[PDB]
Amino acid sequence: VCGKPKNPANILGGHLDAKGSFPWQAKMVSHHNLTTGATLINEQWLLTTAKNLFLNHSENATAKDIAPTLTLYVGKKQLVEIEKVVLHPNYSQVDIGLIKLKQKVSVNERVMPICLPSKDYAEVGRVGYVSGWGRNANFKFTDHLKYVMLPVADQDQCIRHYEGSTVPEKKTPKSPVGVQPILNEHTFCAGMSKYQEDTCYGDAGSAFAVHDLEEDTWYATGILSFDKSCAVAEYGVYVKVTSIQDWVQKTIAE
Amino acid sequence: VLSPADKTNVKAAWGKVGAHAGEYGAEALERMFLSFPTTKTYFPHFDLSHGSAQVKGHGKKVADALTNAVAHVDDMPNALSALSDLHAHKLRVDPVNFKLLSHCLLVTLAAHLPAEFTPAVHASLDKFLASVSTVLTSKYR
Amino acid sequence: GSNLEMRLTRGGNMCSGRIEIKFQGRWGTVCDDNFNIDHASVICRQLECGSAVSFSGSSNFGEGSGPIWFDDLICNGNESALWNCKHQGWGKHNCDHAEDAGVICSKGADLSLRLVDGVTECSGRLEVRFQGEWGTICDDGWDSYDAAVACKQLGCPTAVTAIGRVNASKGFGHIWLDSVSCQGHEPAIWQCKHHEWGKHYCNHNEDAGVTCSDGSDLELRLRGGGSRCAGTVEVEIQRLLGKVCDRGWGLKEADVVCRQLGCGSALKTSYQVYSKIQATNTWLFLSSCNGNETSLWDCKNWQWGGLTCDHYEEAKITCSA
Amino acid sequence: VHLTPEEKSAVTALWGKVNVDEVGGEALGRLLVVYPWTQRFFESFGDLSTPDAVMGNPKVKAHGKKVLGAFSDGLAHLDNLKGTFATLSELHCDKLHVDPENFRLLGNVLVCVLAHHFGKEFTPPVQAAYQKVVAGVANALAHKYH
Ligand code: HEM
Ligand code: HEM
Ligand SMILES: *[C@@H]1O[C@H](CO)[C@@H](O)[C@H](O)[C@H]1NC(C)=O
Ligand SMILES: *[C@@H]1O[C@H](CO)[C@@H](O)[C@H](O)[C@H]1NC(C)=O
Numbered sequence: 001v002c003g004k005p006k007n008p009a010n011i012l013g014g015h016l017d018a019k020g021s022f023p024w025q026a027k028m029v030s031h032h033n034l035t036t037g038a039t040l041i042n043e044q045w046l047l048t049t050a051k052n053l054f055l056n057h058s059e060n061a062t063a064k065d066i067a068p069t070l071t072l073y074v075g076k077k078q079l080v081e082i083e084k085v086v087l088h089p090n091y092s093q094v095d096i097g098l099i100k101l102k103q104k105v106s107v108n109e110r111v112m113p114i115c116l117p118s119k120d121y122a123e124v125g126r127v128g129y130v131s132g133w134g135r136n137a138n139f140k141f142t143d144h145l146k147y148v149m150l151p152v153a154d155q156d157q158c159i160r161h162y163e164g165s166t167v168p169e170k171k172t173p174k175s176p177v178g179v180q181p182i183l184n185e186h187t188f189c190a191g192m193s194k195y196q197e198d199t200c201y202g203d204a205g206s207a208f209a210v211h212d213l214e215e216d217t218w219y220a221t222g223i224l225s226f227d228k229s230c231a232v233a234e235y236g237v238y239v240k241v242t243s244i245q246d247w248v249q250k251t252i253a254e
Numbered sequence: 255v256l257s258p259a260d261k262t263n264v265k266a267a268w269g270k271v272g273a274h275a276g277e278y279g280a281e282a283l284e285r286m287f288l289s290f291p292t293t294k295t296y297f298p299h300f301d302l303s304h305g306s307a308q309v310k311g312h313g314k315k316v317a318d319a320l321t322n323a324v325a326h327v328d329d330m331p332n333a334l335s336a337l338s339d340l341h342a343h344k345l346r347v348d349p350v351n352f353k354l355l356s357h358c359l360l361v362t363l364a365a366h367l368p369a370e371f372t373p374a375v376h377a378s379l380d381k382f383l384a385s386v387s388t389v390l391t392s393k394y395r
Numbered sequence: 396g397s398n399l400e401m402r403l404t405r406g407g408n409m410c411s412g413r414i415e416i417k418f419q420g421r422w423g424t425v426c427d428d429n430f431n432i433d434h435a436s437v438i439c440r441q442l443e444c445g446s447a448v449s450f451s452g453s454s455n456f457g458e459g460s461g462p463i464w465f466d467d468l469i470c471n472g473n474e475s476a477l478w479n480c481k482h483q484g485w486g487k488h489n490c491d492h493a494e495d496a497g498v499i500c501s502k503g504a505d506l507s508l509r510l511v512d513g514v515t516e517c518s519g520r521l522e523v524r525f526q527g528e529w530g531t532i533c534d535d536g537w538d539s540y541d542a543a544v545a546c547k548q549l550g551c552p553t554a555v556t557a558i559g560r561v562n563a564s565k566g567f568g569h570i571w572l573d574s575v576s577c578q579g580h581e582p583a584i585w586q587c588k589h590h591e592w593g594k595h596y597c598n599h600n601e602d603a604g605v606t607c608s609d610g611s612d613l614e615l616r617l618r619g620g621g622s623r624c625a626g627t628v629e630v631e632i633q634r635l636l637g638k639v640c641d642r643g644w645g646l647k648e649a650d651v652v653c654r655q656l657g658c659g660s661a662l663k664t665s666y667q668v669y670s671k672i673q674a675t676n677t678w679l680f681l682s683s684c685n686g687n688e689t690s691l692w693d694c695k696n697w698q699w700g701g702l703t704c705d706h707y708e709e710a711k712i713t714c715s716a
Numbered sequence: 717v718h719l720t721p722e723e724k725s726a727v728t729a730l731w732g733k734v735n736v737d738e739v740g741g742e743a744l745g746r747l748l749v750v751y752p753w754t755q756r757f758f759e760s761f762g763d764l765s766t767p768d769a770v771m772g773n774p775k776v777k778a779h780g781k782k783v784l785g786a787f788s789d790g791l792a793h794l795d796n797l798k799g800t801f802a803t804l805s806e807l808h809c810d811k812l813h814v815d816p817e818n819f820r821l822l823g824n825v826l827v828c829v830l831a832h833h834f835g836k837e838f839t840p841p842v843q844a845a846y847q848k849v850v851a852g853v854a855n856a857l858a859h860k861y862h
């Protein structure tokens with residue numbers, strides 16, 4: 001069953017996930033002790049970002065290089081072995097990888113995949129929940145899973161906030177941070193909350209989960225790609241899942 | 255964050271502090287080394303003790319970099335670009351330590367700036383130092 | 396025909412704002428790419444609002460909305476209307492809405508300059524009236540060419556021009572101009588180069604000031620060293636006594652002072668006990684002399700008042716003679 | 717964690733001079749101004765919108781007075797800190813679900829306020845001792861999330 005958390009909801013921010021409400025969130029740790037996020041999308045597959053998979057590594061690395069160096073946790077502290085990794089054939093515009101597990105994970109109250117959406121929910125103003133294992137205000141990996149509520153931001157406002165102009169040949173890097181996000185038609189942006197909380201180092205790979213009250217179902221509308229959107233820049237940038245749905249179904253079928 | 259009011263206030267405080275900046279940087283470093291001894295292992299070739307000429311010099315360098323950043327506060331990624339490259343690639347400084355140093359710098363300012371540490375100016379300086387740390391940790395890998 | 400209307404929006408009056416053009420009943424804007432003073436002169440002419448004063452991108456008036464009607468205009472400033480300037484065609488542009496041009500004309504601006512809280516009518520804090528309200532200028536980049544332009548505009552003597560605020564309080568309210576950089580030939584301070592109007596980081600502790608003098612009143616003396624050639628360096632400017640701050644005070648500056656009194660060279664910045672010489676509140680700051688100047692007043696960009704030093708102050712000299 | 721006698725003497729000798737009715741409100745207010753997400757837990761406190769309003773809010777002052785009272789109680793029981801703080805940990809964790817990072821965060825704000833109030837007397841060794849104390853208190857207070 002997709003998108004039916006047992007306890008539905010009512011990062012340097014707040015909102016500790018105390019009762020457990022995001023059973024699709026996974027915490028991957030690299031060989032050199034960095035924690036990032038990943039999102040269980042069915043009983044055997046998870047979504048993450050290419051950059052997450054390329055940590056600890058040279059800008060030249062393959063799938064068989066990366067696969068044995070990863071460690072992956074679901075639920076609270078249950079280690080799960082990874083079978084393989086499939087990078088998206090593109091990375092200049094999409095920043096996505098799929099992880100395949102050796103065996104099917106048992107589904108329960110604490111571990112359950114999020115459902116993939118059939119509608120485009122990324123309308124301006126919609127408030128989504130981002131859960132993450134990332135760094136807090138002290139830039140230390142958080143001890144407990146947390147989440148924030150963020151609204152989807154205007155794409156053009158975001159483009160202007162990061163790049164000089166929206167016109168391609170007029171663009172110049174204006175990123176308040178060192179690393180530049182990937183911006184194109186496959187991505188959307190999202191502003192922080194109103195008590196000034198946002199995502200930061202290590203949150204990438206997490207799902208922008210939207211709770212559809214009409215069906216009471218949670219949908220992965222985005223996958224956080226640019227996780228440097230700490231309280232210095234304004235918007236995090238996410239890859240639209242609707243724009244990779246076909247590729248996901250295909251990769252799963254094969 | 256980093257609103258116009260925050261930028262005005264941080265610039266006011268930095269500019270009044272003026273050339274004492276290096277002394278406060280060195281005091282903040284010493285406070286950090288004594289209070290959070292795990293941070294000492296990034297400086298094995300220094301002699302780490304109160305009054306060290308080497309710590310004084312390094313704190314003066316850090317202060318000068320911060321004054322450069324305040325002087326170029328709207329184009330900070332380029333201004334601090336070289337130091338961010340150095341800190342991520344050569345020194346591999348764990349990002350937590352920038353939060354630790356920034357806190358110790360704030361404590362030093364509080365301890366020496368009685369009037370000039372109102373809640374608004376405290377908040378603006380905290381946000382400024384958090385921004386410097388964010389830029390200097392954005393190239394971690 | 397008569398189906399073309401233009402207006403300025405959000406600039407607080409009818410003679411200042413972002414350029415909006417109505418065509419076929421829809422309002423739209425113009426990008427600031429290649430936008431210049433000749434275009435602004437045309438616009439200010441269309442509203443009978445007088446001469447152009449400033450042009451700026453979407454920073455002073457905020458971003459517009461809708462179509463960008465014109466881009467890469469080439470027109471000479473004598474055209475009867477902005478839509479009569481040469482253009483690549485309606486709706487052809489490379490600009491974004493961050494490049495929406497805005498203008499302020501003289502009838503919507505209303506500028507005048509005065510000095511306030513001076514020792515004389517030709518010294519004090521410099522205030523500009525804009526749209527009826529008076530405000531100050533921050534001294535970020537404030538130099539001797541700017542002071543010379545200000546002195547010239549007041550009709551004050553320009554032989555010697557100091558920056559800074561003597562007896563002038565800190566201003567309040569708006570800071571209208573920042574990073575003023577004149578060449579000295581401009582007829583008014585608002586025709587020099589400056590940042591965008593109202594966009595600044597300065598605070599009211601930084602206020603530009605001027606002192607305009609013919610040189611006949613500037614006096615320099617050493618007091619309290621037992622002779623006229625040793626002691627604390629006291630200055631009298633417009634009959635106001637003050638002292639030189641030791642920040643930036645070297646042997647070159649001391650040698651300039653020693654030379655002005657005809658005592659040869661400065662031998663020591665040492666301490667000697669003679670008389671009492673009372674303390675004051677007004678300081679002269681020297682940024683640097685070359686040392687070949689004939690007078691301390693010939694050193695560039697010296698600041699008279701406007702800044703407060705720390706405990707270290709009262710530079711003193713003992714010369715040989 | 718184990719404080720030596722000179723560090724304990726340093727801490728208690730300074731603490732004897734702290735004004736326990738004001739400093740906790742001062743630290744809580746500064747926490748709310750500098751780290752604004754923490755206002756989520758103080759909805760009943762009314763207007764939390766400007767620095768003057770936070771620092772002047774009498775309920776903020778009163779709650780900070782209670783918080784510092786708890787700090788003082790921990791300072792008097794540096795060896796059995798766990799039992800002293802058991803009920804406060806239950807309160808902050810099981811009912812409010814405040815993230816335990818904020819105990820550390822509040823501690824660092826408190827250190828900054830003490831530095832501002834005591835100036836040169838807040839020497840580097842005294843700061844180090846207070847950092848040890850506040851780290852131990854934060855770790856004790858976060859015990860129920862384990
Ligand atoms: C806001 C925080 C900081 C700033 C602005 C800063 C600034 C600087 C500057 C200006 C230099 C000298 C660069 C040069 O000489 O070209 C430097 C060097 C260095 N920094 Fe930092 N620093 C900060 C915090 C830290 C911390 C907390 C650590 C380690 C715990 C660290 C690790 C290093 C190392 C290892 C060096 C090399 C020293 C050398 O080459 O002499 N930095 N930093
Ligand atoms: C860091 C160490 C802290 C300690 C030792 C502490 C201690 C206390 C104390 C003594 C009380 C009063 C309990 C009573 O009167 O029965 C209290 C209540 C409370 N605490 Fe804290 N506090 C701390 C920090 C925080 C933080 C960081 C938050 C929120 C982020 C928080 C949220 C609250 C609230 C909202 C109450 C009042 C609840 C109510 O009145 O219903 N506290 N805590
Ligand atoms: C760091 O990595 C090493 C090597 O994998 C491991 O033994 C150690 O437990 C890790 N430490 C942390 C804090 O994760
Ligand atoms: C990868 O990029 C190529 C070139 O733009 C494009 O044709 C192809 O469709 C992309 N891959 C996928 C899976 O869409």
Ligand SMILES: *[C@@H]1O[C@H](CO)[C@@H](O)[C@H](O)[C@H]1NC(C)=O
Pocket residue numbers: 512513514562563634635
């Ligand atoms: C300085 O003091 C007052 C107030 O600014 C001013 O009127 C006066 O002219 C100045 N001093 C002298 C000696 O003229």
Ligand SMILES: [Ca+2]
Pocket residue numbers: 428466467488489490
């Ligand atoms: Ca153009």
Ligand SMILES: [Ca+2]
Pocket residue numbers: 536537538539541574575576577
């Ligand atoms: Ca100038």
